[PDB]
Amino acid sequence: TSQVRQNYHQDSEAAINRQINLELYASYVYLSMSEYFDRDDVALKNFACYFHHQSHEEHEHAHKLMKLQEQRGGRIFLQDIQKADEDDWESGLNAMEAALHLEKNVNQSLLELHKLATDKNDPHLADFIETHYLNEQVKAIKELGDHVTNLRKMGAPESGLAEYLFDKHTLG
Amino acid sequence: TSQVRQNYHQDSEAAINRQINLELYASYVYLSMSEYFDRDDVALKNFACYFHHQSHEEHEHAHKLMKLQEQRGGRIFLQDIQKADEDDWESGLNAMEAALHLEKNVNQSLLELHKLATDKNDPHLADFIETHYLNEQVKAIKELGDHVTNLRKMGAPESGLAEYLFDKHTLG
Amino acid sequence: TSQVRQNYHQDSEAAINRQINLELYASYVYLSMSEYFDRDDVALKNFACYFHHQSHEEHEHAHKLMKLQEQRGGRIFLQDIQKADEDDWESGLNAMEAALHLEKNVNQSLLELHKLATDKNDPHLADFIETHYLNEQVKAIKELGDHVTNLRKMGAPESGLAEYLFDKHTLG
Amino acid sequence: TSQVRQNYHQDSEAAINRQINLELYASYVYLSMSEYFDRDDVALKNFACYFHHQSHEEHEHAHKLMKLQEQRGGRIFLQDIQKADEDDWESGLNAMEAALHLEKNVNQSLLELHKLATDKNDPHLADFIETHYLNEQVKAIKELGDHVTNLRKMGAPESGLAEYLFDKHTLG
Amino acid sequence: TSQVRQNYHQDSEAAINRQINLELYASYVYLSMSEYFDRDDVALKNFACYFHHQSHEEHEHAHKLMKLQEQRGGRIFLQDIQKADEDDWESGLNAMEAALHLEKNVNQSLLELHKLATDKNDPHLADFIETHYLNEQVKAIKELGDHVTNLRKMGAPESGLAEYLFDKHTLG
Amino acid sequence: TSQVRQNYHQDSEAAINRQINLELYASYVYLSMSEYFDRDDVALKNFACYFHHQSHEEHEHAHKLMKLQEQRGGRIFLQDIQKADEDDWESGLNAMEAALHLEKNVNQSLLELHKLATDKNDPHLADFIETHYLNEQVKAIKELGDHVTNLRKMGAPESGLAEYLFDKHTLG
Ligand SMILES: CC(=O)NCCNc1cccc2c(S(=O)(=O)O)cccc12
Ligand SMILES: CC(=O)NCCNc1cccc2c(S(=O)(=O)O)cccc12
Ligand SMILES: CC(=O)NCCNc1cccc2c(S(=O)(=O)O)cccc12
Ligand SMILES: CC(=O)NCCNc1cccc2c(S(=O)(=O)O)cccc12
Ligand SMILES: CC(=O)NCCNc1cccc2c(S(=O)(=O)O)cccc12
Ligand SMILES: CC(=O)NCCNc1cccc2c(S(=O)(=O)O)cccc12
Ligand SMILES: [Ca+2]
Ligand SMILES: [Ca+2]
Ligand SMILES: [Ca+2]
Ligand SMILES: [Ca+2]
Ligand SMILES: [Ca+2]
Ligand SMILES: [Ca+2]
Ligand SMILES: [Ca+2]
Ligand SMILES: [Ca+2]
Ligand SMILES: [Ca+2]
Ligand SMILES: [Ca+2]
Ligand SMILES: [Ca+2]
Ligand SMILES: [Ca+2]
Ligand SMILES: [Ca+2]
Ligand SMILES: [Ca+2]
Ligand SMILES: [Cu+2]
Ligand SMILES: [Cu+2]
Ligand SMILES: [Cu+2]
Ligand SMILES: [Cu+2]
Ligand SMILES: [Cu+2]
Ligand SMILES: [Cu+2]
Ligand SMILES: [Cu+2]
Ligand SMILES: [Cu+2]
Ligand SMILES: [Cu+2]
Ligand SMILES: [Cu+2]
Ligand SMILES: [Cu+2]
Ligand SMILES: [Cu+2]
Ligand SMILES: [Cu+2]
Ligand SMILES: [Cu+2]
């Protein structure tokens, strides 16, 4: 038991590990989306850059959690980063829709992590989730929501012109 | 026989000459495309600038080969630069499609030039092709591929609005 | 079959995918090492920074390969990033030794990738491996070799003073 | 018949096309001369640079004409760029003499183009020839004349020292 | 057997050593030429500077090879640097001719080194030779070729004025 | 007999040649030491840089002597640069000890060169040795002495920590 450990329940420790893996999974899904839009038969460069940026963001979210684990005296146990559910993301709108869905899932897990921290009277971990994750999630979900709305109204996916112009004007 | 000649087979020499002529031909095809888009009944200024730039690029590719020929002690024998297969390129998408096709043909010739250099154990010429041509070809083909994809999805050629906006947003 | 595909054998395509996964695995192993040295009962900050840097380097190596796959007209198929063989890296010297070992394994795979490219007469892929990977591997292996040597001579791992000073003077 | 066409006789249009091809031919001859002086058994670097510059100048002369054709509503029809009369230019003086001769021929064609424009009462085309070509030709011919004179007086071609020093002092 | 050694055949190792010695020999020959032109009865200062520069260039070529040897896990075994075939280089043209000859010999050895690397499936060593040596050799040989040509045409060696002016205008 | 020769005895001339060869030998020994410390099983980077610097210093010492030879009207006759007595320098301390020993030997030769110049009443050569060599030798010997002392007191060679820290703090 670590010299620095204080008020850090083994349930929280294990949940942080589960959360670390999910951020890496989120990161990985976005990496897959990113390369998809670089395919010569898709070729939406800004969609690619956007999702490549999201990928590195999710990585930072993982780093912060790993840091937290060692700051608290817990032990990091890493698990396989699972490949995404699809290799082919079909369209710009569909990728946004899958992204929105993924972010809500990460958010649900984070909310249960906060519940766990409240239940265990770990107020340092509660504030840590609120400060670095909860509003970041709310912002991400809303932005993805905004994108899905604009793509739908522009006539995507039955309009290839729509995805082209959105790539230029919103993501460019 | 040149004072500088070393390990330079007469088959390679002649193939370099054939390759020089092809770069000039590629350059010439692009020059034709370039002026086409400046026609008052076509008037796509950025398509014109793009193909005018491609023309001068193919010229540099020719210069590098001519330089190589004299560096190795071979003799340059120049042949007529043949006019392109068409005077009228029909549309933006069609020009891109013809360009992609042309670049693949130049690439095939370059790959056979590399085979010839491997077969003749000319490793200076092999590296010369790899370094200055092979990846340049791969990049060009992919970019042209990307363009053809975006034009097709935007509704070209049955959409004049599509070619207009692509000229503005991708080539502008 | 892609509009851009030329001279790109399905065996090479699949091998690039296998190589992509290995770079990500290498990246992941280094991430694990990085966080290990941030543990309060290890606390070697520069060892941590060094391995964190190696992690992002292996990521770039993966990006370049993914780019190559789509440049050539192949399709990226991503696989799970497997967790490392150990959660606890024991010591500075041991991590270096595991790193050297890992890099030699990545190098062996890259050499077989080059053999495959030679065998398939894909000279663009051969040069791609030589240019961006082979010397990077040779440099990495030698640097890791240098580190293992200095740590061993300093009296590691039976000297905690040795690992402390190496962290300060070589990695600082 | 073009929306922009006005006072532009089909004889002028065809003559512009013939002139375009000649500028490209002139450009091509100069390119041949340029590489000749880079041969290891010739090795006059400044003669090479001078003729390489002349080559690109003749290209601009072609561009201006192509521009003119489309400005006037004519249609560009490109023809093969014929290879030069010689692959081996023998000496510095001989290349200058061939260049002077070529320029006078281009000038004669331009003068007949002006006659055609006068005869057809196309004063825009007449001024276009006067403004951008006639004095450029007069300057070129005189400069080439000056060079041939100096080379002859210096003792070329029976003096290799003469061609060396002229390369250094006039073209350097 | 080194901790870093991988795919590095003992034949390649020994050939690198033989090549190291030759670069040093080349360096030494050039040093001899350099001082020769500083003799009061020769006194061609720029010929001296040119060959002094060549000497240090060949030294760098040796350094790069020594670096390569230790990067690969081979052991450097150094041999005597043999003195040149002549103490008296006779003339500027003769030194250039001896230099051209020497460089072709170094090039032949490098080409056999590449063959050895191909035969041993050492693609890191093959690329190393291509990248850092083969084109450097091609450039050197051609430059020396150019110099010998100009000196011969200027009337060297029966013209002391020729060697004087070449020293001033080409090497100055 | 040279136009510039004055008061320059053939014994001095020959001794300068013998001294030139020794500086080159010293240079060569240091080059060998330099690469030794870059071996992956030695890996003392600053020891390597120090000895690499010593190597180029001994080269300058050779240049100055060659210059002197031609300034005085003597003729340079170069001899083989002999390889060092050892390929493997064993340790940092041992290399310093071998270096100190070598420098004393060069110094002894220089002192006999001065004696020769005094005996031959060549006061230009005497001052040349005093000015450019004798104090440089005294400084070098003392510095090497200082290094050997510090290494011995630090516990080298039975302390690998000692050689590591000396590499960092004195040579870094
Ligand atoms: C096509 C493309 O990739 N465009 C750039 C998109 N933006 C980005 C991508 C990756 C990382 C980024 C980072 S960082 O996480 O590395 O700090 C910071 C800021 C922007 C980033
Ligand atoms: C309408 C139009 O022509 N726009 C400019 C397009 N870009 C270019 C065209 C021609 C040559 C270029 C060159 S260079 O080959 O001359 O160096 C370098 C960079 C850009 C170039
Ligand atoms: C303790 C710690 O992390 N220190 C910084 C170590 N260096 C680095 C770490 C991660 C990424 C780096 C990157 S980049 O891949 O992001 O471009 C570029 C340069 C250095 C990098
Ligand atoms: C050895 C050599 O080539 N030297 C340079 C000679 N000058 C030139 C050559 C080619 C094009 C030039 C151009 S432009 O047409 O590209 O604008 C403008 C100005 C000078 C130019
Ligand atoms: C008369 C005379 O010696 N003139 C200077 C000639 N050029 C040179 C000589 C030696 C070394 C040089 C180096 S370097 O190898 O030291 O980096 C770099 C650049 C030029 C160099
Ligand atoms: C690892 C390594 O090599 N580090 C640099 C060590 N210092 C030096 C090495 C070689 C030549 C030097 C020279 S000069 O002789 O080229 O002028 C001047 C100053 C320093 C020099
Ligand atoms: Ca996000
Ligand atoms: Ca799985
Ligand atoms: Ca191109
Ligand atoms: Ca024809
Ligand atoms: Ca690495
Ligand atoms: Ca697993
Ligand atoms: Ca290569
Ligand atoms: Ca002209
Ligand atoms: Ca013909
Ligand atoms: Ca050289
Ligand atoms: Ca001998
Ligand atoms: Ca010294
Ligand atoms: Ca010997
Ligand atoms: Ca004195
Ligand atoms: Cu990335
Ligand atoms: Cu996240
Ligand atoms: Cu717009
Ligand atoms: Cu142009
Ligand atoms: Cu090309
Ligand atoms: Cu990171
Ligand atoms: Cu890697
Ligand atoms: Cu210290
Ligand atoms: Cu050009
Ligand atoms: Cu012209
Ligand atoms: Cu020197
Ligand atoms: Cu060399
Ligand atoms: Cu050196
Ligand atoms: Cu010395």
UniProtKB/Swiss-Prot annotation, chains A, B, C, D, E, F:
Effect of E103A: No effect on iron binding but the oxidation rate is severely reduced
Result of altering E23A: Reduces iron binding and oxidation rate
CDD domains for the chain: Euk_Ferritin
GO biological process, one term: negative regulation of fibroblast proliferation
Disulfide feature: none
Ferritin-like diiron domain boundaries: 6-155
PROSITE patterns assigned: FERRITIN_1 (PS00540), FERRITIN_2 (PS00204), FERRITIN_LIKE (PS50905)
Catalytic activity, EC: 1.16.3.1
GO cellular component: autolysosome; autophagosome; cytoplasm; cytosol; extracellular exosome; extracellular region; ferritin complex; ficolin-1-rich granule lumen
InterPro entries: Ferritin, Ferritin-like, Ferritin-like_diiron, Ferritin-like_SF, Ferritin_CS, Ferritin_DPS_dom
Quaternary state and interactors: Oligomer of 24 subunits. There are two types of subunits: L (light) chain and H (heavy) chain. The major chain can be light or heavy, depending on the species and tissue type. In the human liver, the heavy chain is predominant. The functional molecule forms a roughly spherical shell with a diameter of 12 nm and contains a central cavity into which the insoluble mineral iron core is deposited. Interacts with NCOA4; NCOA4 promotes targeting of the iron-binding ferritin complex to autolysosomes following starvation or iron depletion.
Disease with which this protein is associated in UniProt: Hemochromatosis 5: A disorder of iron metabolism characterized by iron overload. Excess iron is deposited in a variety of organs leading to their failure, and resulting in serious illnesses including cirrhosis, hepatomas, diabetes, cardiomyopathy, arthritis, and hypogonadotropic hypogonadism. Severe effects of the disease usually do not appear until after decades of progressive iron loading. Neurodegeneration with brain iron accumulation 9: An autosomal dominant neurodegenerative disorder associated with iron accumulation, primarily in the basal ganglia. It is characterized by global developmental delay apparent from infancy, and progressive decline of motor and cognitive skills. Clinical features include delayed walking or inability to walk, spasticity with hyperreflexia, ataxia, dystonia, and poor or absent language.
Gene assigned in the entry: FTH1
Lineage, uppermost ranks: Eukaryota, Metazoa, Chordata, Craniata, Vertebrata
Expression sites (tissue/organ): Expressed in the liver.
Protein name, per record: Ferritin heavy chain
Record key words, sorted: Acetylation, Cytoplasm, Cytoplasmic vesicle, Iron, Iron storage, Lysosome, Metal-binding, Neurodegeneration, Oxidoreductase, Phosphoprotein
Binding site for Fe cation 2: E58, E103, Q137
Compartment(s) of residence: Cytoplasm; Lysosome; Cytoplasmic vesicle, Autophagosome
